Amino acid sequence: FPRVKNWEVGSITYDTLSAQAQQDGPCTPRRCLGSLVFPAPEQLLSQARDFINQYYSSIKRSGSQAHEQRLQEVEAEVAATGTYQLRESELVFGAKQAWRNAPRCVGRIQWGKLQVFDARDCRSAQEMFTYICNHIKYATNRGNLRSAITVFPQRCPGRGDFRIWNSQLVRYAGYRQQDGSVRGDPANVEITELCIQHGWTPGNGRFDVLPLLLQAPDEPPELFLLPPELVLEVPLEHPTLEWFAALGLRWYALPAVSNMLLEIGGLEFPAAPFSGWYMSTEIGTRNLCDPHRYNILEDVAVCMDLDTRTTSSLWKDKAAVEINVAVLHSYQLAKVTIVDHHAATASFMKHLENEQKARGGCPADWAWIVPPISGSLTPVFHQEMVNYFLSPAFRYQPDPW
Amino acid sequence: FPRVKNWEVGSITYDTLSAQAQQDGPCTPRRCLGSLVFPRPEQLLSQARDFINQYYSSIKRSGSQAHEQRLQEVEAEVAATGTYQLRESELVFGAKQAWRNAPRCVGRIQWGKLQVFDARDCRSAQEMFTYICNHIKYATNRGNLRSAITVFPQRCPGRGDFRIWNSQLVRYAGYRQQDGSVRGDPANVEITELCIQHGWTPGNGRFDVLPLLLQAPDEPPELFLLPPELVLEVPLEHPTLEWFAALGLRWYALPAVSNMLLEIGGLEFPAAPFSGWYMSTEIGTRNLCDPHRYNILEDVAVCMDLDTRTTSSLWKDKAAVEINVAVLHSYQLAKVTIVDHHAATASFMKHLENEQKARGGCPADWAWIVPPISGSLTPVFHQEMVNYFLSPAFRYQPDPW
Numbered sequence: 004f005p006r007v008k009n010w011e012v013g014s015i016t017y018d019t020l021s022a023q024a025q026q027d028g029p030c031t032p033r034r035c036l037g038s039l040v041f042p043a044p045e046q047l048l049s050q051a052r053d054f055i056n057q058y059y060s061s062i063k064r065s066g067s068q069a070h071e072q073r074l075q076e077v078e079a080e081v082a083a084t085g086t087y088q089l090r091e092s093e094l095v096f097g098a099k100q101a102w103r104n105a106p107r108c109v110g111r112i113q114w115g116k117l118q119v120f121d122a123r124d125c126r127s128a129q130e131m132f133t134y135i136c137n138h139i140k141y142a143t144n145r146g147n148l149r150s151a152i153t154v155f156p157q158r159c160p161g162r163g164d165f166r167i168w169n170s171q172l173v174r175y176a177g178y179r180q181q182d183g184s185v186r187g188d189p190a191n192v193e194i195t196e197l198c199i200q201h202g203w204t205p206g207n208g209r210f211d212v213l214p215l216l217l218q219a220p221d222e223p224p225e226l227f228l229l230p231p232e233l234v235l236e237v238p239l240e241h242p243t244l245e246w247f248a249a250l251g252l253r254w255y256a257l258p259a260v261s262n263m264l265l266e267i268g269g270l271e272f273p274a275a276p277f278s279g280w281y282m283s284t285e286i287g288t289r290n291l292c293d294p295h296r297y298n299i300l301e302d303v304a305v306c307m308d309l310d311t312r313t314t315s316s317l318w319k320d321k322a323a324v325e326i327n328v329a330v331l332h333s334y335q336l337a338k339v340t341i342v343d344h345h346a347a348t349a350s351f352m353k354h355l356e357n358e359q360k361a362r363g364g365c366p367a368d369w370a371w372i373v374p375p376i377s378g379s380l381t382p383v384f385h386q387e388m389v390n391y392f393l394s395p396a397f398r399y400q401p402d403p404w
Numbered sequence: 405f406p407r408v409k410n411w412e413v414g415s416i417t418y419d420t421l422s423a424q425a426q427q428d429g430p431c432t433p434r435r436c437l438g439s440l441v442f443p444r445p446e447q448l449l450s451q452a453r454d455f456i457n458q459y460y461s462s463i464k465r466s467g468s469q470a471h472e473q474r475l476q477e478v479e480a481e482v483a484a485t486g487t488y489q490l491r492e493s494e495l496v497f498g499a500k501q502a503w504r505n506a507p508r509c510v511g512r513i514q515w516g517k518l519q520v521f522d523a524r525d526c527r528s529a530q531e532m533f534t535y536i537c538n539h540i541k542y543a544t545n546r547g548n549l550r551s552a553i554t555v556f557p558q559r560c561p562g563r564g565d566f567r568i569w570n571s572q573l574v575r576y577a578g579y580r581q582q583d584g585s586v587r588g589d590p591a592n593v594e595i596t597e598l599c600i601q602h603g604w605t606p607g608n609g610r611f612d613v614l615p616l617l618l619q620a621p622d623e624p625p626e627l628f629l630l631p632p633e634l635v636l637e638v639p640l641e642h643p644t645l646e647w648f649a650a651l652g653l654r655w656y657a658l659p660a661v662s663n664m665l666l667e668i669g670g671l672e673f674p675a676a677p678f679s680g681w682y683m684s685t686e687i688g689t690r691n692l693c694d695p696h697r698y699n700i701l702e703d704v705a706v707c708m709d710l711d712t713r714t715t716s717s718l719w720k721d722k723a724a725v726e727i728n729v730a731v732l733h734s735y736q737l738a739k740v741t742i743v744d745h746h747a748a749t750a751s752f753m754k755h756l757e758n759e760q761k762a763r764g765g766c767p768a769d770w771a772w773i774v775p776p777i778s779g780s781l782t783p784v785f786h787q788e789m790v791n792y793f794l795s796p797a798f799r800y801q802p803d804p805w
């Protein structure tokens with residue numbers, strides 16, 4: 004069992020939970036690939052059995068009559084139909100466990116507080132849209148954000164998948180141009196082109212909210228516009244740099260990832276969007292300052308009258324700090340939930356301690372947990388971590404086009 | 405052959421050099437341990453033969469002549485004596501190779517410029533001190549720092565080892581009180597008490613340069629006072645914050661690590677101190693702002709009149725950036741070589757590109773290459789990296805007690 008040291012304090016623990024690692028990652032004794040972004044009834048039964056054991060452990064019914072009854076029933080259903088169905092309480096437990104198990108999520112202190120919307124009866128792309136609208140309305144909650152997931156019907160033999168083609172429920176268009184440059188968010192060029200190809204009339208601003216492309220089983224994707232009053236946005240201003248507001252920058256309240264696959268007990272839910280609230284560095288550092296995103300850093304540094312001709316003036320660091328200040332100030336001014344990277348990493352340290360007592364460890368991806376600015380100023384920098392894959396899980400999946 | 409992507413540009417390479425990894429790292433298919441600081445004879449001829457082959461490859465002299473001849477003499481030398489002696493040019497080539505192979509070093513663009521002092525004919529703690537003194541004066545060079553390594557004799561069976569007991573050649577003392585808590589550097593509390601427990605009369609200050617504990621084979625260590633004239637230091641001032649100088653902070657010019665073991669062709673040099681020049685974050689972010697180092701961040705924020713009552717003011721980030729500015733400004737004013745983290749990481753990306761075409765890849769430890777502040781503002785953040793062990797190498801070794 005791997006020994007894990009915290010170098011700030013001197014703490015030492017042993018991750019016994021990693022021995023239960025359900026699947027295999029990309030590393031070998033020869034070479035570590037930890038930094039890479041992208042790392043049959045008998046085996047369905049084996050996964051289902053393990054999940055049922057997890058569930059009956061959680062409700063203190065391990066080895067009970069009800070437990071073996073459920074195991075037998077799942078066995079029988081897989082034999083009769085090639086698959087099985089989760090009970091409502093099992094689905095809620097499995098979705099929370101998937102969040103709990105997500106190695107790259109720093110917000111997991113919240114994992115037990117998750118609103119689970121059961122849309123497994125969804126029949127069409129039109130009903131899917133209605134479920135998604137109510138997810139956005141519930142989770143946004145006029146700025147007092149609430150964590151939620153909506154889970155659409157599972158993958159099943161004989162029918163195609165439900166899929167949301169968008170990577171998030173709220174995204175800004177990226178318009179390719181000539182001179183070659185992108186207007187708007189360069190991360191979203193491909194989905195923007197698909198929306199146009201599917202009949203969307205594009206705008207030409209830098210912050211145009213994309214329509215949704217929703218795919219029902221064995222059907223082409225269908226375009227749905229989000230009511231503007233459902234999409235809460237925050238104009239960005241800085242508390243002391245008054246010219247900052249003239250940049251015309253905005254970001255949206257609700258981070259709602261919609262392109263990942265939820266796996267519970269061998270069953271797969273290719274459409275299950277989930278949302279929480281933002282950590283400010285995701286917006287201020289990555290979305291606004293990445294060179295391949297909005298890339299505002301030099302324009303902000305010039306406006307700040309910093310010396311951008313030499314790197315040792317640390318103009319990049321100074322400008323990025325004030326952009327993050329602007330994000331926090333603006334969301335707080337707008338009364339939209341947001342967490343700075345210091346509070347978030349401190350709460351993640353408490354989660355690690357909670358999980359060491361509860362389960363004997365915690366899967367965590369150091370390079371994703373450590374924030375993209377001020378890394379060693381946060382306590383997670385000094386915490387050794389062990390990365391591994393537990394199920395139930397959120398998994399990446401290929402784009403449906 | 406692992407596929408490696410840069411996410412800022414979109415470019416892809418394959419690391420074919422990984423296929424040559426020798427020592428097994430700590431990771432397995434089921435769990436990654438990349439964030440851990442410490443990863444948990446006819447064998448001599450195999451490592452010597454391999455290293456000799458490396459040497460003659462690098463000079464286009466594989467496949468006959470002195471290559472064939474050098475192979476037999478190491479064979480005979482080991483057959484006769486059980487060990488072997490490196491030629492001077494091999495010691496030079498091997499030292500540069502171990503530096504080139506160091507996965508955690510961001511300064512490897514410089515790997516070809518290394519001054520190798522051959523101290524293999526040393527045989528007393530008195531000779532060591534003269535060697536270490538030659539190195540420090542040469543490497544310091546009045547502030548125009550020059551990369552250098554001094555190689556004391558290779559370990560051999562039956563006799564003790566040459567070892568430097570200090571982790572670096574220049575370190576600051578750390579002293580306790582009625583309350584354990586430290587005046588000085590907490591990293592060096594252990595060696596401070598060893599030095600005092602060997603004759604050294606302690607100082608009173610927060611920046612007392614420690615003496616050297618030098619260990620000739622099979623003898624107790626011997627204290628040596630470094631000539632103050634030979635330890636170049638930089639008082640810390642800020643370009644616009646007039647009071648920063650009054651904080652009384654200083655740091656030294658030369659980073660010279662002295663507790664690592666140099667391994668070349670199966671031979672082991674437990675005493676082989678190497679030096680370069682600092683990257684400014686090492687001083688300003690880690691040494692001065694780590695909570696378990698000088699922990700000055702709140703003191704600087706009070707002086708800047710920052711609101712330390714809420715994390716979301718980003719007072720930690722602001723104070724940290726100004727400390728790093730003060731380090732860079734002070735070292736440049738003192739005309740002591742230093743490199744900021746933007747310049748250093750940009751050079752490492754050029755190094756990665758050079759190594760791709762020369763050797764087919766480059767062992768790199770993402771968590772150590774990405775700097776401890778402003779990570780995603782540097783290009784290395786967006787570069788996937790592959791970590792593995794090649795020989796020659798610098799290795800960690802246990803403390804000599």
Ligand code: HEM
Nearest residue numbers: 102105106107108109110113150277278279280281282397
């Ligand atoms: C409640 C507030 C939350 C915060 C502050 C938060 C924070 C974060 C952050 C900063 C990341 C890294 C993303 C990036 O760098 O681009 C992340 C990743 C992730 N989050 Fe959370 N999150 C929250 C809620 C949730 C919820 C409710 C779920 C699911 C139910 C979730 C699941 C995930 C997953 C699956 C990933 C990355 C996938 C992986 O591990 O490979 N998060 N989160």
Ligand code: HEM
Nearest residue numbers: 503506507508509510511514551678679680681682683798
């Ligand atoms: C010339 C300028 C150099 C710079 C700017 C530089 C910078 C750095 C930095 C920032 C680290 C990270 C360590 C930490 O953050 O605590 C490092 C590690 C390291 N450096 Fe360099 N360094 C330089 C020269 C050298 C030289 C000359 C050698 C040896 C001949 C060397 C060998 C190493 C080793 C062995 C490590 C630890 C790496 C590992 O364990 O894989 N460096 N360096």
Ligand SMILES: Cc1cc(N)nc2cc(-c3ccc(OCC4CC4)c(CN)c3)ccc12
Nearest residue numbers: 040110258259260277278279280281282285
């Ligand atoms: C619920 C939630 C809240 C939050 N506050 N943040 C979140 C960030 C991500 C996330 C996941 C993966 C990912 O990247 C995947 C790689 C592009 C394929 C990114 C973008 N870095 C963000 C996912 C969910 C989040």
Ligand SMILES: Cc1cc(N)nc2cc(-c3ccc(OCC4CC4)c(CN)c3)ccc12
Nearest residue numbers: 441511659660661678679680681682683686
């Ligand atoms: C030549 C050189 C230049 C430089 N500019 N920097 C350097 C930093 C280290 C180094 C290596 C390992 C290490 O960590 C060991 C762990 C504490 C036991 C630390 C301290 N973090 C520094 C080693 C050499 C360096």
Ligand SMILES: C[C@H](O)[C@H](O)[C@H]1CNc2nc(N)[nH]c(=O)c2N1
Nearest residue numbers: 038039040370371785786787788
């Ligand atoms: C190549 C590198 O793994 C990549 O840029 C990662 C690093 N760490 C990250 N960490 C978070 N939270 N989000 C990210 O997108 C990334 N990107």
Ligand SMILES: C[C@H](O)[C@H](O)[C@H]1CNc2nc(N)[nH]c(=O)c2N1
Nearest residue numbers: 384385386387439440441771772
């Ligand atoms: C736990 C973690 O591995 C540890 O804090 C590492 C992270 N990255 C680092 N990177 C550098 N350059 N130096 C360090 O000491 C560390 N410390």
Ligand SMILES: [Cl-]
Nearest residue numbers: 258285286290
């Ligand atoms: Cl985002």
Ligand SMILES: [Cl-]
Nearest residue numbers: 659686687691
């Ligand atoms: Cl140091």
Ligand SMILES: [Gd]
Nearest residue numbers: 242243244245
């Ligand atoms: Gd102002």
Ligand SMILES: [Gd]
Nearest residue numbers: 249250302306
């Ligand atoms: Gd402008």
Ligand SMILES: [Gd]
Nearest residue numbers: 647707708709
């Ligand atoms: Gd004052």
Ligand SMILES: [Zn+2]
Nearest residue numbers: 030035431436
């Ligand atoms: Zn690994």
